[PDB]
């Protein structure tokens, strides 16, 4: 999306400190706990009963790395998000049947996870920039839905 040069440097600076596999499994974990109906796609994963079983589920961690890895590689192409995620958008629509609203819930959860891991370094201007990106990513992935 349209981020000023300083906003992009802000986004890139903080992400370099992120453990992609850790945050990935933590963002998807809280997505399934806070918004339980998102579990409709993960019935084949196993025990999703309690918050503890979901956070400690290995299959939930496995997918979380896969999702956050695609997101991570996406930041290298912020000036062309629709072009980068054009294929994933088709797949999530015609084969996975994932309601795009799921992308907006995860983006918000990802922002809360970043506030938790970084604390006071996740200042208001920094949050402002990351919101535009979780929204830009969510829009690109929902672009090919028909």
């Amino acid at each position: 999306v349209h981020l000023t040069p300083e906003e992009k440097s802000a986004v890139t600076a903080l992400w370099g400190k992120v453990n992609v596999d850790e945050v990935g499994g933590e963002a998807l974990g809280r997505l399934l706990v806070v918004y339980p109906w998102t579990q409709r796609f993960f019935e084949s994963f196993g025990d999703l009963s309690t918050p503890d079983a979901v956070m400690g589920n290995p299959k939930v961690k496995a997918h979380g790395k896969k999702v956050l890895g695609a997101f991570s590689d996406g930041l290298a192409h912020l000036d062309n998000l629709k072009g980068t995620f054009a294929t994933l958008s088709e797949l999530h629509c015609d084969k996975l049947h994932v309601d795009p609203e799921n992308f907006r819930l995860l983006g918000n959860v990802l922002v809360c996870v970043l506030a938790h891991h970084f604390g006071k370094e996740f200042t208001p201007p920094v949050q402002a920039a990351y919101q535009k990106v979780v929204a830009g990513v969510a829009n690109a992935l929902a672009h090919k839905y028909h």
């Binding site: 806070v34 918004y35 339980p36 109906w37 998102t38 579990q39 409709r40 629509c93 049947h97 994932v98 309601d99 795009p100 609203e101 799921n102 929902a142 839905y145 028909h146």
Partner: protein, 141 residues
């Protein structure tokens, strides 16, 4: 938050629907699928084309459940208890899609009942559908 006037407007308008409820149900669904393509993700096993009997059968089930609510407007939580559990623990439809269906349901009524769809009745129906949607998502978490 449904006042006596609202309830009267609802019974009056839904009473004039009567036997055509099933046809109106299927039309509302058809309008939603075309105008809001995302909602199609919840029916990948259906033949979502014009005149589809599957959609007509579902439209009838939705319309009857609404007829059930209008008859128990003063006790909706218990009359839809079973439906609340089904959508919350099995179907898992994201809450935003209920507003999309409600709108399409209002458009269908307005296109079939012109003289009955006054700006006051319009107000009551919208509040009624929002209350139906609150009960259907009340047990999501």
């Amino acid at each position: 938050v449904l006042s006596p006037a609202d309830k009267t407007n609802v019974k009056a308008a839904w009473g004039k629907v009567g036997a055509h409820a099933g046809e109106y149900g299927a039309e509302a669904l058809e309008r939603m699928f075309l105008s809001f393509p995302t909602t199609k993700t919840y029916f990948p096993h259906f033949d979502l084309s014009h005149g589809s009997a599957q959609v007509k059968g579902h439209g009838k089930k939705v319309a009857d459940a609404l007829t059930n609510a209008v008859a128990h407007v003063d006790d909706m939580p218990n009359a839809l208890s079973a439906l609340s559990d089904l959508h919350a623990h099995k179907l898992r439809v994201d809450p935003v899609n209920f507003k999309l269906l409600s709108h399409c349901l209002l458009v269908t009524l307005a296109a079939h009942l012109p003289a009955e769809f006054t700006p006051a009745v319009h107000a009551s129906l919208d509040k009624f559908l929002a209350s139906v949607s609150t009960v259907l998502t009340s047990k999501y978490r």
